[PDB]
Symmetry: C4
Subunit: 138 residues, 4 copies
């Protein structure tokens, strides 16, 4: 398993949508969608929210007015799995730098005293056997 597991999913979405868009727009916007290789570029350009609608979406949507859905969704999904991936890094850093190291520094402190108690206990019971061996001796 892993984080670099969404970066697979994401790089899947990235490919999924790239070809999806070559299929539609390569037709009429052959500089943006003319090949797969430009889609990849344009889709990275588009993920980076740089003249995404004004530049690309609008004039495409100019053509295929439903294209909006294609652009909007892509952005939603794309950026959103980066949020899930940006988070994956916050977590697997924020419960790694401190929380995996204390995670065991108090897993160790705590069992370093069920060790003191359970000996102290054993000590008081060799007291009870020494005392209760002197109501059986008085």
């Amino acid at each position: 398993p892993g984080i670099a597991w969404i970066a697979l999913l994401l790089l899947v979405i990235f490919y999924v949508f790239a070809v999806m868009g070559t299929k539609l727009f390569a037709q009429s916007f052959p500089e943006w969608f003319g090949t797969l290789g430009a889609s990849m570029y344009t889709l990275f350009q588009v993920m980076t929210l740089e003249s995404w609608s004004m530049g690309i979406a609008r004039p495409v949507i100019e053509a295929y007015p439903w294209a909006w859905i294609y652009f909007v969704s892509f952005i939603l999904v794309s950026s959103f799995t980066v949020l899930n991936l940006f988070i994956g890094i916050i977590i697997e850093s924020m419960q790694s730098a401190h929380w995996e190291a204390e995670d065991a520094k108090r897993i160790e402190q705590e069992q370093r005293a069920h060790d003191e108690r359970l000996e102290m206990l054993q000590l008081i019971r060799d007291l009870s056997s020494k005392v209760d061996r002197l109501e059986r001796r008085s």
Copy 2:
């Protein structure tokens, strides 16, 4: 309740302002605010700050010179209830993955020794009952 509760709120702010925009600018920016759906689009774009100002705000502000307040507010609000949503996940995931788990492991490893303590205590007053039972017997 929930954090998919601000996703309701946001998706109202978004519809509020969409109808606000359409009612206003539909008139003279009918490309952007021509329909409710048109503004729903524009405002996604404005939210993604992609030629948001140079593209939409400023030209809407030339015509309607107070629209800045509209646009700057919508941005401030919308984006702000995403910061309020983006953290709604770093929290609900950073204290759900590390700190829901330990929350019970140290809730446990503490109440596991009110066990050892309160029983070992008992052992001592059973010893105190056996010894004080032998100054009243010596």
Copy 3:
């Protein structure tokens, strides 16, 4: 007293800079820096990094070629005292929604047994006198 103290500071930076730019560029970029309240806009737009350079800076810098330091520094400072403020919310949220109620659950779980151990102690000294009065009573 709080996080809104940078909000103040950042609302300072915003004001200082909006005047400095009015005094400089009002002159030749009046639409952007003509009034105070339009440098306020323009620097809201600069802060949002929307056509920031290619739309404002490049042009201002065509004219005044040291204005770069102005823009860059503003951006740096601005988005930095925001990174500073953005975090002053993850922090003031992640040790407030979890690390505040535990912070008192196990400052209280702790002091619930300096109050057991320290009763258990006496009860053991009360066994040390009643026994130490039996090497002298034997």
Copy 4:
């Protein structure tokens, strides 16, 4: 060394890349890469994703087709070694306003009852040497 150590790294990449693009695009794109401190600029602008591609890269890629790798990877690398640094601020901020304080108040609270325990044991042992000097007396 730490957060400010990737600021060295980032400030490395930034430099690396600037001279590269000056040794490359200084020729044909001299507004952006004519000099060093124009690549330094353009690169800042390119980093902040302001017209990075439609403005710079796409036209640079109009000259040199492979130039794409140059801008993509700068963004990938650059923006990435800030995710790395941004996060190095939530971390070295998160477990530092709440967790460099508790990790010592709980290094302490634990150490104050190795001290309670330890003295209690001794108290039990001296209780034992007293009892065990009373099998041998009775």
